[PDB]
Design an enzyme around this catalytic site. Structure first.
Site, PDB file in Angstrom:
ATOM      1  N   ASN A 137      68.502   1.596  74.015  1.00  0.00           N
ATOM      2  CA  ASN A 137      69.911   2.066  74.066  1.00  0.00           C
ATOM      3  C   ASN A 137      70.123   2.885  75.351  1.00  0.00           C
ATOM      4  O   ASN A 137      71.252   3.369  75.542  1.00  0.00           O
ATOM      5  CB  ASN A 137      70.276   2.794  72.765  1.00  0.00           C
ATOM      6  CG  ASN A 137      70.256   1.887  71.545  1.00  0.00           C
ATOM      7  OD1 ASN A 137      69.523   2.124  70.590  1.00  0.00           O
ATOM      8  ND2 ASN A 137      71.065   0.840  71.549  1.00  0.00           N
ATOM      9  N   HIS A 182      68.605   5.649  76.446  1.00  0.00           N
ATOM     10  CA  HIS A 182      68.214   7.071  76.296  1.00  0.00           C
ATOM     11  C   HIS A 182      66.784   7.228  76.836  1.00  0.00           C
ATOM     12  O   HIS A 182      66.014   6.234  76.857  1.00  0.00           O
ATOM     13  CB  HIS A 182      68.383   7.531  74.835  1.00  0.00           C
ATOM     14  CG  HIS A 182      69.682   7.153  74.184  1.00  0.00           C
ATOM     15  ND1 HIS A 182      69.761   6.198  73.173  1.00  0.00           N
ATOM     16  CD2 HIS A 182      70.946   7.610  74.361  1.00  0.00           C
ATOM     17  CE1 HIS A 182      71.014   6.075  72.773  1.00  0.00           C
ATOM     18  NE2 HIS A 182      71.762   6.930  73.490  1.00  0.00           N
ATOM     19  N   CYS A 212      68.078  14.027  78.026  1.00  0.00           N
ATOM     20  CA  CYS A 212      67.912  13.987  79.491  1.00  0.00           C
ATOM     21  C   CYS A 212      68.458  12.640  79.966  1.00  0.00           C
ATOM     22  O   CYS A 212      68.027  11.609  79.425  1.00  0.00           O
ATOM     23  CB  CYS A 212      66.444  14.204  79.825  1.00  0.00           C
ATOM     24  SG  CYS A 212      66.042  13.984  81.574  1.00  0.00           S
TER      25      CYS A 212
END
Ligand SMILES: Fc1cccc(F)c1-c1nc2ncsc2cc1Cl
Ligand SMILES: Fc1cccc(F)c1-c1nc2ncsc2cc1Cl
Lengths: 276, 276
Positions: free
Chosen positions: A198, A200, A235
């Protein structure tokens, strides 16, 4: 599906836990000739995913129910705590059991036991704290009574704790280390390979970064026994991170990941180390 | 052993090739929801290591014969060439056949076919040139007639080629890319996690570093179809890498890895891309 049939696992008799075993592969082992923490963490995720799959969650946002999908609700990790007594070797068969209980009204706890299947000896255990969040507001929720019914069918009613001992290191608060830090690893940027489905930044990347902070002398002479990680912020792929550490042959370190520019906290952690 | 009883794999009747199949796990899939190149590379290593184990090679060495053990000799990659027609999805099963034939007396060639597990349709293939190296001096070696005796029993007599076609891309020389290069990724450093049993940089890391050099537009809109990588000189754990690329609905890149300080060539490569 074919994978469910072939996989070395299955729901357990009461249907309230999942068990799967993995043959440690040749590329999964590090400088200590044993499985890296990264490998262990991956297998913790894999068995977590396969548990979800086996009770009928349709791998969307992970562990999300039919209602949660509709109300745009998700599970996010607040805490991960891994403890390894013994890292498995290339060609070892590791059994991992995992299950999920309620964690008051805020969310959910997933535990893991890690066995060498041959001996049957516990070589590690793990526990993790998750909270419901609206994916649109990114703001925390009382776990709706509707949702609870949908998932608690598949959870033990009475406590099952991987960490049943009293003042468990797994629930210890982690304080903010005082700057300047004894050791630092500066200007770290996610690599492409670090990004999940996804897009991330992967949990294993945060693990890596914590270890990058540790002095060569310690990794040369010691092995990671426990890691605790509290997550505050995701992050971004182009974010730039400073990973810090200080102390507090058996030693602990306090950890802290922040953005190089902002100074904003991404995560904090603790790591305990045993001598080789 | 229990691992070999539980693996979806086995030598073929003739004892000259090895087949093992894999369920694509949750963390092995990238942004396209399919296995990453890093997973496919990893799987090619594993099946090769398990073929070695299957004909009586020991641990602490990939296909290092009784003599190689004694001389502190290992096998290293001179050239890797991979082609994927279709990346398996999360949950899919791929079979990989692998075997090893001799490459004059400079070293050995390992080849791979990748098939869909159910149908047996070919979705990928690979070939490689390996050379002996003293693991201490890290220096390339005359292939002993002693060692040839020890392994040659387990290599088919007559050529078996994953790339049987005429002027095969797999055997084509790679030119030096012209600097300054269109695309760059500078100051790349091996992570602690990139280092294997013996403390040197993994085969797969060099592939990653090549993909780091490709522009985001391409990775967003294309899949890697082929890679050819030459390994000229090793990356040390303390080295810093610049990864370069330029071009030369199907697009190609010339690649070049050199050390930031020295300017020394470690690797050169080609990558072919298909549109998603
Ligand atoms: F996957 C699950 C199968 C069965 C029961 C469960 F509770 C879960 C579950 N596991 C989780 N792990 C981290 S958050 C989370 C939420 C749920 Cl509902
Ligand atoms: F593992 C092997 C099983 C059987 C026969 C073989 F020739 C090998 C072998 N495979 C290699 N793959 C890359 S270098 C290398 C060297 C050898 Cl001797």
């Amino acid at each position: 599906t074919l994978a469910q049939r072939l996989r070395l696992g299955s729901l357990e008799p009461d249907g309230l836990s999942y068990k799967e075993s993995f043959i440690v592969r040749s590329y999964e082992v590090g400088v200590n000739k044993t499985a890296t923490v990264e490998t262990i963490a991956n297998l913790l995720q894999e068995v977590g995913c396969n548990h979800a799959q086996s009770v009928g969650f349709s791998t969307d946002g992970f562990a999300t129910t039919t209602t949660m999908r509709l109300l745009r609700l998700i599970w996010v990790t607040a805490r991960m705590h891994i403890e390894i007594y013994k890292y498995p070797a290339w060609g070892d068969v590791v059994e991992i059991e995992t299950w999920c209980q309620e964690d008051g009204k805020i969310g959910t706890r997933r535990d893991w036991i890690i066995k060498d299947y041959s001996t049957g000896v516990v070589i590690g255990r793990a526990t993790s704290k998750w909270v419901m969040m609206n994916q649109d507001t990114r703001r925390l929720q009382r776990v709706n009574d509707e949702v609870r019914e949908e998932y608690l069918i598949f959870c033990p009613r009475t406590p099952r704790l991987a960490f049943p001992e009293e003042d468990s290191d797994s629930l210890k608060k982690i304080p903010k280390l005082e700057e300047p830090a004894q050791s630092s690893k500066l200007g770290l940027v996610p690599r492409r390979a670090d990004l999940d489905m996804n897009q991330h930044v992967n949990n294993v990347t945060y693990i890596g970064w914590v270890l990058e902070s540790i002095p060569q002398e310690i990794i040369d002479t010691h092995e990671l026994q426990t890691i605790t990680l509290d997550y505050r912020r995701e992050c971004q792929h182009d974010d730039i991170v400073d990973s810090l550490s200080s102390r507090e042959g058996e030693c602990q370190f306090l950890h802290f990941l922040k953005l190089s520019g902002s100074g904003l906290e991404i995560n904090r952690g603790r790591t305990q180390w045993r001598r080789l």
